């Protein structure tokens with residue numbers, strides 16, 4: 384008779400009021416993040432290397448520094464890769480982890496393995512230090528409000544290893560992080576003791592971010608069972624714009640677009656979604672014109688965009704959590 388799983392089909396947004404946003408637009412400050420959240424991620428960081436680890440620590444410190452009561456839990460494993468077994472580790476960052484329901488956020492901190500062509504390295508700027516670093520200034524910004532969390536539903540933050548693939552994408556050499564977890568998180572009952580429900584059973588919603596940081600992104604509305612949460616993201620945008628809180632932004636050149644399209648882009652939402660969770664996959668289509676090049680660097684980013692895309696995702700969740 385598990386009622387409380389049923390609670391994400393229908394759950395509505397706590398829509399904020401005119402000058403509620405007008406703070407959130409000033410609670411969030413991009414540069415800090417860009418100096419402090421971001422640039423310590425812009426190093427090679429494929430798995431088994433030191434740039435992993437280093438990426439792993441800098442993420443956690445910036446989830447420990449916070450007043451909110453995060454519990455950071457690690458998921459280390461070994462998993463045959465085309466270079467033989469190796470050691471992976473998802474980050475997790477749940478508020479209130481016996482809370483039955485979690486809005487989830489997500490994004491692979493690893494980064495593809497690219498030969499130092501022309502002596503140059505691949506750091507993953509759009510792909511995806513921006514999502515991770517987007518997923519820190521949330522926390523920080525919403526520190527002040529998340530502290531009130533100490534409708535059984537909070538937040539949680541994940542960070543994936545080996546989304547990418549060492550050599551050639553495939554179902555045995557891609558999304559190593561997700562695949563392993565989404566496994567587990569279907570086997571780890573939840574809350575602790577629940578005899579017919581698994582943590583997934585509480586995963587309200589998998590907002591995935593990925594390939595973020597370049598101008599003029601284009602986010603399709605991939606799914607029918609998460610439109611109403613896609614739409615939510617357009618709306619917020621619509622008016623934020625018409626109030627004056629965005630930066631180099633035009634109605635025509637909006638980000639989300641309620642134009643469903645061709646088809647699927649498989650990413651780390653998948654193993655969960657191939658198990659029956661709502662995703663809110665936030666992946667532009669077209670990708671950036673740099674996607675997997677030694678030009679995915681920091682320059683080829685756009686401040687004004689992520690700043691704008693920063694504001695939207697913090698608002699969305701607030702409304703969501705009802706805070």
Ligand SMILES: CCCOc1ccc([C@H]2CNC(=O)N2c2ccc3nc[nH]c3c2)cc1
Nearest residue numbers: 546547552647648649650669670671672674
């Ligand atoms: C303009 C760039 C378009 O190129 C594409 C790149 C990736 C994909 C998707 C679609 N199916 C996949 O498996 N893709 C893929 C490949 C590698 C990735 N690394 C991170 N995300 C990836 C997605 C499609 C077009």
Ligand SMILES: [Zn+2]
Nearest residue numbers: 495510547675
């Ligand atoms: Zn990639």
